Amino acid sequence: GPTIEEVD
Amino acid sequence: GKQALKEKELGNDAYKKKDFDTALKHYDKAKELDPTNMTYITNQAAVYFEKGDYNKCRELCEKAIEVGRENREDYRQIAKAYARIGNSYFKEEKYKDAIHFYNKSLAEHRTPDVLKKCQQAEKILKEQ
Ligand code: NI
């Protein structure tokens, strides 16, 4: 489910 | 520079497996080797966000922004840092603040994901 914050 | 980025990438690998301790530590080493790169700080902000620590995430996003305005070339990462602050409000259902921060992000760099998230919040807010 839930989207994860993206790391750069 | 070189090792900084190898530190960030091990952190990135950890974060993606929800090993947040390890991410934060490698992110710290990255920041000690190159204090002027706001990406490591926004990366830490992501960790706190996935931990539920919305407040720390915002704090870290704010610092990343002060470091980036110094760089002066980093509008796209500045954009990311504002949209992360937006996201952290969105998660707490603080939609007016979410939207405000998305607008800040978009004004820096327009991106589809952030536009779509903004419209989602505007709709929730509309229909409340
Ligand atoms: Ni404002």
Coordinates of N, CA and C and ligand atoms in Angstrom, one line a residue:
Chain A
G1 N 0.8 -1.2 0.0 CA 0.0 0.0 0.0 C 0.9 1.3 0.0
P2 N 0.8 2.1 1.1 CA 1.4 3.4 1.2 C 2.7 3.7 0.4
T3 N 2.8 4.8 -0.3 CA 4.0 5.2 -1.0 C 5.1 5.6 0.0
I4 N 6.3 5.3 -0.3 CA 7.5 5.7 0.5 C 8.1 6.9 0.0
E5 N 8.5 7.9 0.8 CA 9.3 9.1 0.5 C 10.5 8.6 -0.3
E6 N 10.9 9.3 -1.3 CA 12.0 8.9 -2.2 C 13.3 9.6 -1.7
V7 N 14.3 8.7 -1.6 CA 15.7 9.3 -1.3 C 16.5 9.6 -2.6
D8 N 17.3 10.6 -2.5 CA 18.1 10.9 -3.7 C 19.5 10.4 -3.5
Chain B
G1 N 33.4 14.2 -1.3 CA 32.7 14.1 -2.6 C 32.5 12.6 -3.1
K2 N 33.6 11.9 -3.4 CA 33.5 10.5 -3.8 C 33.0 9.5 -2.7
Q3 N 33.7 9.5 -1.6 CA 33.2 8.7 -0.5 C 31.9 9.2 0.1
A4 N 31.6 10.5 0.0 CA 30.4 11.0 0.5 C 29.2 10.3 -0.2
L5 N 29.4 10.1 -1.5 CA 28.3 9.6 -2.3 C 28.2 8.0 -2.1
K6 N 29.3 7.3 -1.9 CA 29.3 5.9 -1.4 C 28.6 5.8 0.0
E7 N 28.9 6.8 0.9 CA 28.1 6.7 2.2 C 26.6 6.9 2.0
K8 N 26.2 7.9 1.2 CA 24.8 8.2 0.9 C 24.1 6.9 0.3
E9 N 24.8 6.3 -0.7 CA 24.2 5.2 -1.3 C 24.0 4.0 -0.4
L10 N 25.0 3.7 0.5 CA 24.7 2.6 1.5 C 23.5 3.0 2.4
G11 N 23.4 4.3 2.7 CA 22.3 4.8 3.5 C 21.0 4.5 2.7
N12 N 20.9 5.0 1.5 CA 19.8 4.8 0.6 C 19.4 3.3 0.6
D13 N 20.3 2.4 0.4 CA 20.1 0.9 0.5 C 19.4 0.5 1.8
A14 N 19.9 1.0 2.9 CA 19.3 0.7 4.3 C 17.9 1.3 4.4
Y15 N 17.7 2.5 4.0 CA 16.4 3.2 4.1 C 15.3 2.4 3.4
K16 N 15.7 2.0 2.2 CA 14.8 1.1 1.4 C 14.4 -0.2 2.0
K17 N 15.1 -0.6 3.0 CA 14.8 -1.9 3.8 C 14.3 -1.6 5.2
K18 N 14.0 -0.3 5.4 CA 13.5 0.2 6.6 C 14.5 0.0 7.8
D19 N 15.7 0.0 7.4 CA 16.8 0.0 8.4 C 17.2 1.4 8.6
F20 N 16.5 2.1 9.5 CA 16.6 3.6 9.5 C 17.8 4.0 10.3
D21 N 18.2 3.3 11.4 CA 19.4 3.4 12.2 C 20.7 3.5 11.2
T22 N 20.7 2.6 10.3 CA 21.9 2.4 9.4 C 21.9 3.6 8.4
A23 N 20.8 3.9 7.9 CA 20.6 5.0 7.0 C 21.1 6.3 7.5
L24 N 20.6 6.7 8.7 CA 20.9 7.9 9.5 C 22.4 8.0 9.7
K25 N 23.0 6.9 10.2 CA 24.5 6.8 10.3 C 25.3 7.1 9.1
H26 N 24.9 6.3 8.0 CA 25.6 6.6 6.7 C 25.3 8.0 6.2
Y27 N 24.1 8.5 6.3 CA 23.8 9.9 6.0 C 24.6 10.9 6.8
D28 N 24.8 10.7 8.1 CA 25.7 11.5 8.9 C 27.1 11.5 8.3
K29 N 27.7 10.4 8.0 CA 29.1 10.3 7.5 C 29.2 11.1 6.1
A30 N 28.2 11.0 5.3 CA 28.1 11.7 4.1 C 28.0 13.2 4.3
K31 N 27.3 13.7 5.4 CA 27.2 15.1 5.7 C 28.5 15.7 6.3
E32 N 29.2 14.8 7.0 CA 30.5 15.2 7.6 C 31.5 15.4 6.5
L33 N 31.4 14.6 5.4 CA 32.4 14.7 4.3 C 32.0 15.8 3.4
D34 N 30.8 16.2 3.4 CA 30.4 17.3 2.5 C 29.2 18.0 2.9
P35 N 29.3 18.9 3.9 CA 28.4 19.7 4.5 C 27.5 20.6 3.6
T36 N 27.9 20.8 2.4 CA 27.2 21.8 1.6 C 26.1 21.1 0.7
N37 N 26.1 19.8 0.7 CA 25.1 19.0 -0.1 C 23.8 18.8 0.7
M38 N 22.8 19.5 0.3 CA 21.4 19.4 1.0 C 20.7 18.0 0.8
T39 N 21.1 17.3 -0.2 CA 20.5 16.0 -0.5 C 20.6 15.0 0.7
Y40 N 21.8 15.0 1.5 CA 21.9 14.1 2.6 C 20.9 14.5 3.7
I41 N 20.8 15.8 3.9 CA 19.9 16.3 4.9 C 18.4 16.0 4.5
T42 N 18.0 16.2 3.2 CA 16.6 15.8 2.8 C 16.4 14.3 2.9
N43 N 17.5 13.5 2.6 CA 17.5 12.1 2.9 C 17.2 11.7 4.3
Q44 N 17.8 12.4 5.2 CA 17.5 12.2 6.7 C 16.1 12.6 6.9
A45 N 15.6 13.7 6.4 CA 14.2 14.1 6.5 C 13.3 12.9 6.1
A46 N 13.6 12.2 5.0 CA 12.8 11.1 4.5 C 12.8 10.0 5.6
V47 N 13.9 9.8 6.3 CA 14.0 8.8 7.3 C 13.0 9.1 8.5
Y48 N 13.1 10.3 9.0 CA 12.2 10.7 10.0 C 10.7 10.6 9.6
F49 N 10.4 11.0 8.4 CA 9.1 10.9 7.8 C 8.6 9.4 7.9
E50 N 9.4 8.5 7.4 CA 9.0 7.1 7.4 C 8.9 6.5 8.9
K51 N 9.6 7.1 9.8 CA 9.5 6.8 11.2 C 8.2 7.4 11.9
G52 N 7.6 8.4 11.3 CA 6.4 9.0 11.8 C 6.7 10.3 12.5
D53 N 8.0 10.7 12.5 CA 8.5 11.8 13.2 C 8.4 13.0 12.3
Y54 N 7.2 13.5 12.1 CA 6.9 14.5 11.0 C 7.6 15.8 11.4
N55 N 7.6 16.1 12.7 CA 8.2 17.3 13.2 C 9.7 17.4 12.9
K56 N 10.4 16.3 13.1 CA 11.9 16.3 12.9 C 12.1 16.4 11.3
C57 N 11.2 15.8 10.6 CA 11.4 15.8 9.1 C 11.3 17.2 8.6
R58 N 10.3 17.9 9.1 CA 10.2 19.3 8.8 C 11.4 20.1 9.2
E59 N 11.9 19.9 10.4 CA 13.0 20.6 10.9 C 14.2 20.4 10.0
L60 N 14.4 19.1 9.6 CA 15.5 18.8 8.7 C 15.4 19.4 7.3
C61 N 14.2 19.4 6.7 CA 13.8 20.1 5.5 C 14.2 21.5 5.4
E62 N 13.9 22.2 6.5 CA 14.2 23.7 6.7 C 15.7 23.9 6.6
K63 N 16.5 23.1 7.4 CA 17.9 23.2 7.3 C 18.5 23.0 5.9
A64 N 17.9 21.9 5.3 CA 18.4 21.6 3.9 C 18.2 22.8 3.0
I65 N 17.0 23.5 3.1 CA 16.7 24.7 2.4 C 17.7 25.8 2.6
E66 N 18.0 26.1 3.9 CA 19.1 27.2 4.2 C 20.4 26.8 3.5
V67 N 20.8 25.5 3.6 CA 22.1 25.1 2.9 C 22.0 25.2 1.4
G68 N 20.9 24.9 0.8 CA 20.7 25.0 -0.6 C 20.6 26.5 -1.1
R69 N 20.0 27.4 -0.4 CA 19.9 28.8 -0.9 C 21.3 29.4 -1.0
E70 N 22.2 28.9 -0.1 CA 23.7 29.2 -0.2 C 24.3 28.7 -1.5
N71 N 24.0 27.4 -1.8 CA 24.5 26.8 -3.1 C 24.1 27.7 -4.3
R72 N 22.8 28.0 -4.2 CA 22.2 28.8 -5.2 C 21.8 28.2 -6.5
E73 N 22.4 27.0 -6.8 CA 22.1 26.2 -8.0 C 21.1 25.0 -7.8
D74 N 20.5 25.0 -6.6 CA 19.8 23.7 -6.2 C 18.2 23.8 -6.2
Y75 N 17.7 24.7 -7.0 CA 16.2 24.8 -7.1 C 15.4 23.5 -7.1
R76 N 15.9 22.5 -7.7 CA 15.2 21.2 -7.8 C 15.2 20.5 -6.4
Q77 N 16.3 20.5 -5.7 CA 16.3 19.9 -4.4 C 15.5 20.7 -3.4
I78 N 15.5 22.1 -3.5 CA 14.8 23.0 -2.7 C 13.3 22.6 -2.9
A79 N 12.9 22.5 -4.2 CA 11.6 22.0 -4.6 C 11.2 20.7 -3.9
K80 N 12.1 19.8 -3.8 CA 11.9 18.5 -3.2 C 11.7 18.6 -1.7
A81 N 12.5 19.5 -1.1 CA 12.4 19.7 0.4 C 11.1 20.4 0.7
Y82 N 10.7 21.4 0.0 CA 9.3 21.9 0.3 C 8.2 20.8 0.1
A83 N 8.2 20.0 -1.0 CA 7.2 19.0 -1.2 C 7.2 18.0 -0.1
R84 N 8.4 17.7 0.4 CA 8.5 16.8 1.6 C 7.8 17.4 2.8
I85 N 8.0 18.7 3.0 CA 7.3 19.4 4.1 C 5.8 19.3 3.8
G86 N 5.4 19.6 2.6 CA 4.0 19.4 2.3 C 3.5 18.0 2.6
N87 N 4.2 16.9 2.2 CA 3.8 15.6 2.5 C 3.6 15.3 4.0
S88 N 4.5 15.8 4.8 CA 4.5 15.6 6.2 C 3.2 16.3 6.8
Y89 N 2.8 17.4 6.3 CA 1.5 18.0 6.7 C 0.4 17.2 6.3
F90 N 0.4 16.7 5.0 CA -0.6 15.9 4.4 C -0.9 14.6 5.2
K91 N 0.2 14.0 5.7 CA 0.1 12.8 6.5 C -0.6 13.1 7.8
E92 N -0.5 14.2 8.4 CA -1.2 14.6 9.6 C -2.5 15.3 9.4
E93 N -3.0 15.2 8.1 CA -4.3 15.8 7.7 C -4.3 17.4 7.9
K94 N -3.1 18.0 7.8 CA -3.1 19.5 7.9 C -3.0 20.1 6.6
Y95 N -4.1 20.0 5.8 CA -4.1 20.1 4.4 C -3.8 21.5 3.9
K96 N -4.2 22.5 4.6 CA -3.9 23.9 4.2 C -2.4 24.1 4.1
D97 N -1.7 23.6 5.2 CA -0.3 23.6 5.2 C 0.4 22.8 4.1
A98 N -0.1 21.5 3.9 CA 0.3 20.7 2.8 C 0.3 21.5 1.5
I99 N -0.9 22.1 1.2 CA -1.1 22.8 -0.1 C -0.2 24.0 -0.2
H100 N 0.0 24.7 0.8 CA 0.9 25.9 0.8 C 2.3 25.5 0.4
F101 N 2.8 24.5 1.1 CA 4.1 24.0 0.8 C 4.3 23.3 -0.6
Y102 N 3.2 22.7 -1.1 CA 3.3 22.2 -2.5 C 3.4 23.4 -3.5
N103 N 2.7 24.4 -3.3 CA 2.8 25.6 -4.1 C 4.2 26.2 -4.0
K104 N 4.8 26.2 -2.8 CA 6.2 26.6 -2.7 C 7.1 25.7 -3.6
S105 N 6.9 24.4 -3.5 CA 7.7 23.5 -4.3 C 7.6 23.7 -5.8
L106 N 6.3 23.8 -6.2 CA 6.0 23.9 -7.6 C 6.6 25.2 -8.3
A107 N 6.6 26.3 -7.4 CA 7.1 27.5 -7.9 C 8.6 27.4 -8.2
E108 N 9.3 26.6 -7.4 CA 10.7 26.3 -7.6 C 10.9 25.4 -8.8
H109 N 10.2 24.3 -8.9 CA 10.3 23.3 -10.0 C 9.0 22.7 -10.2
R110 N 8.4 22.8 -11.4 CA 7.1 22.1 -11.5 C 7.4 20.6 -11.7
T111 N 6.7 19.7 -10.9 CA 6.8 18.3 -11.2 C 5.4 17.7 -11.1
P112 N 5.1 16.6 -12.0 CA 3.8 16.0 -12.0 C 3.4 15.3 -10.6
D113 N 4.3 14.7 -10.0 CA 3.9 14.0 -8.8 C 3.4 15.0 -7.8
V114 N 4.1 16.1 -7.7 CA 3.8 17.1 -6.7 C 2.5 17.9 -7.1
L115 N 2.3 18.1 -8.4 CA 1.1 18.7 -8.8 C -0.1 17.8 -8.5
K116 N 0.0 16.5 -8.7 CA -1.0 15.5 -8.5 C -1.3 15.5 -7.0
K117 N -0.3 15.4 -6.1 CA -0.5 15.4 -4.6 C -1.2 16.7 -4.1
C118 N -0.8 17.9 -4.7 CA -1.5 19.1 -4.4 C -3.0 19.1 -4.8
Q119 N -3.3 18.7 -6.0 CA -4.7 18.5 -6.4 C -5.5 17.6 -5.5
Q120 N -4.9 16.5 -5.1 CA -5.5 15.6 -4.1 C -5.9 16.4 -2.9
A121 N -5.0 17.2 -2.3 CA -5.2 17.9 -1.1 C -6.3 19.0 -1.3
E122 N -6.3 19.6 -2.5 CA -7.2 20.7 -2.8 C -8.6 20.2 -2.8
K123 N -8.8 18.9 -3.3 CA -10.0 18.3 -3.4 C -10.5 17.9 -2.0
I124 N -9.6 17.3 -1.2 CA -10.0 16.9 0.1 C -10.5 18.2 0.9
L125 N -9.7 19.2 0.8 CA -10.0 20.5 1.4 C -11.3 21.1 0.9
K126 N -11.5 21.1 -0.4 CA -12.7 21.6 -1.0 C -13.9 20.9 -0.4
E127 N -14.0 19.6 -0.4 CA -15.1 18.8 0.0 C -15.3 18.6 1.6
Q128 N -14.4 19.2 2.4 CA -14.5 19.2 3.9 C -15.7 20.0 4.5
Ligands
NI1 NI 4.5 30.5 3.7

